[PDB]
């Protein structure tokens, strides 16, 4: 599943990232660097037409759903490249199948100014000359790996072979589903940027801190990532909505209630939520009818607009 | 091609639009409506690795390239839908093929509070089943046309009949490939929103109006629409770059462009359209020519793609 040979190398990265977690500075720095670069900060939208169904509170939807073809992947990558740069690494590697992660990796590296090399499967190479094209346009040595299978796994290995050799100057950039996810806390932390961005936006758009910041808890981290920046704001309730069918407060939301919110959001604002987001919404509206006129609530709309259209359409 | 029966209804929309064109009211209303909604305001990005290469001017990129392939269909549809509401229409109809125009149109109606009807070929309805479900989740009514041989052509024709009969309260939303485009001015004007956005964003990010705003002029209205909002800002230069009313035109050669192309990829990791690359080349000379601390706003119009090949060949 992972060579043992990766252990000292992974241990190096974790220990180095552990030093970053002491302050907000790493995160702050990432947020600076990615500002207006590829999608970040995702928009905060005041859903004025939901207001009437939420006790006339002001519902603000943190729009993590506005991500598709591009925005997305650069986010993980840029975090990593920044870490590589602060570990005094000078060079970055990765594997990619079809080429999307190699392009993101190559992107983060031109941006931050770091040599970069990408490992592509032999017959993967000659069936997208284009991403290769992007990658070489981005300045990245593409090593088209001939040796056995031809279909990713052999590239993972050279990439692995590389990383152990060169570990003093090289960072491995992870992001393919078929590759290793060795640093799960580092991934979680990158999610806190949602709340960091949403805390600036809600005070600029709403003129203060919110009454509440709300997320569906089955989105995992990334739904929950909106909370961290509001932990020291004693006036701000943090409410995680649990899917039920039939410091943080946790509250249940049934299938029906999610479903009805899903449809109201499509009809009131023209936005088609993930069933995940519709629970956070359904709770946001109950919470506004609780809190009344003049309340301000922030909702993490996490998960994918498309996915659930089928299930929603059956349901109705 | 276009039925003559349509002349009066087209004539009413053009007349009413020409009266909106008078002031920035209509556009300020679109701007407000769509803020944070589906992509607009596109970001304004300070390209600080490029400064080295431009007299140490500051180059800001107006990131039209961050559009989704798709971001543009709701943008145009929201404009038409807000105009229907501002004219007093209560209802908006359209035809759709595979469903995208229908989904865009229903999304704009749900947003603005308007009744929606979409006419689809009876067959198109069966094949594009989840575009239909999106439409109805959106609250639109979807008519699977049973007339003729249940074709797109037959759909359009039912939609033209409903338009004519219900013109007092009903607006027709254009922008399928098989449909007409009776209002090119309207569509060109919507592009003015680019410079209105960028005029706000350059004062927050840079603290003042810029020294120039720049765009590549082969890129049509999508290029040239950044200029309008700064027209009355004497002190802001307006430069249009072309592949060699107060706007200045200058030529940019193929190899000035391709050097700007490779420079943007390599310094910023942004792969531009060749079209963006000409404006980016022009902005690099102009910073050399205005020098240190000069704020130059560049329209990055067109799509960072299909020029990829052509850029690869070149290099």
Curated annotation (Swiss-Prot), chain A:
This protein's pathway reads: Amino-acid biosynthesis; L-tryptophan biosynthesis; L-tryptophan from chorismate: step 5/5
Catalytic function, reaction form: (1S,2R)-1-C-(indol-3-yl)glycerol 3-phosphate + L-serine = D-glyceraldehyde 3-phosphate + L-tryptophan + H2O
Q: Which cysteines are joined by disulfide bonds?
A: none
E.C. no: 4.2.1.20
What InterPro entries does the record tag this protein with? Trp_synth_b_CS (IPR006653), Trp_synth_beta (IPR006654), Trp_synth_beta/beta-like (IPR023026), TrpB-like_PALP (IPR001926), TrpB-like_PALP_sf (IPR036052)
How does this chain assemble? Tetramer of two alpha and two beta chains.
One Pfam family named in its UniProt record: PALP
Q: N6-(pyridoxal phosphate)lysine (modified residue): where?
A: 73
Q: Which keywords, in A-to-Z order, does the entry hold?
A: Amino-acid biosynthesis, Aromatic amino acid biosynthesis, Lyase, Pyridoxal phosphate, Tryptophan biosynthesis
Does this UniProt record's set of keywords contain Heme?
Answer: no
**What Gene3D superfamilies does its record include?**
3.40.50.1100
Source domain of life: Bacteria
Name of protein? Tryptophan synthase beta chain
GO terms, molecular function: tryptophan synthase activity
Q: Write down the PANTHER family for this protein, in alphabetical order.
A: TRYPTOPHAN SYNTHASE, TRYPTOPHAN SYNTHASE-RELATED
What is the originating organism of this protein?
Answer: Mycobacterium tuberculosis (strain CDC 1551 / Oshkosh)
Concerning its family, UniProt says: Belongs to the TrpB family.
| Role description | The beta subunit is responsible for the synthesis of L-tryptophan from indole and L-serine.
Q: Which GO terms describe its cellular component?
A: cytoplasm
The top of its lineage is: Bacteria, Bacillati, Actinomycetota, Actinomycetes, Mycobacteriales
Enzyme superclass (EC): lyase
Q: Which cofactor does it need?
A: pyridoxal 5'-phosphate
């Amino acid at each position: 599943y992972v060579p043992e040979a990766l252990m000292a190398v992974i241990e190096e990265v974790t220990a180095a990232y552990q030093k970053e977690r002491v302050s907000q500075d790493f995160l702050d720095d990432l947020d600076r660097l990615q500002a207006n670069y590829a999608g970040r900060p995702s928009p905060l939208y005041e859903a004025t037409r939901l207001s009437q169904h939420a006790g006339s509170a002001r519902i603000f939807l943190k729009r993590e759903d506005l991500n598709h073809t591009g925005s997305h992947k650069i986010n993980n990558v840029l975090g990593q490249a920044l870490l590589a740069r602060r570990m005094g690494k000078t060079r970055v590697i990765a594997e990619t199948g079809a080429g999307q992660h190699g392009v993101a990796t190559a992107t983060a590296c031109a941006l931050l100014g770091l040599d970069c090399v990408i490992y592509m499967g032999g017959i993967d190479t000659a069936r997208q000359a284009l991403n290769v094209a992007r990658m070489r346009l981005l300045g990245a040595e593409v090593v088209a790996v001939q040796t056995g299978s031809k279909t990713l796994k052999d590239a993972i290995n050279e990439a692995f072979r590389d990383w152990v050799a060169n570990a003093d100057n090289t960072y491995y950039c992870f992001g393919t589903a078929a590759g290793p996810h060795p640093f799960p806390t580092m991934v979680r932390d990158f999610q806190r940027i949602i709340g960091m961005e949403a805390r600036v936006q809600i005070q600029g758009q709403a003129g203060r801190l919110p009454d509440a910041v709300v997320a569906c808890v089955g989105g995992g981290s990334n739904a929950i990532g909106i909370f961290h920046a509001f932990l020291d704001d004693p006036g701000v309730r943090l409410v995680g909505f649990e899917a039920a069918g039939d410091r943080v407060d946790y509250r249940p939301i049934t299938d029906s209630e999610a479903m009805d919110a899903f449809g109201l959001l499509c009809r009131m604002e023209g936005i088609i939520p993930a069933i995940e987001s519709a629970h956070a919404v359904a709770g946001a509206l109950k919470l506004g009818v609780e809190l009344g006129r003049g309340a301000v609530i922030v909702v993490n709309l996490s998960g994918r607009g498309d996915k659930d259209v089928e299930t929603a359409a059956k349901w109705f």
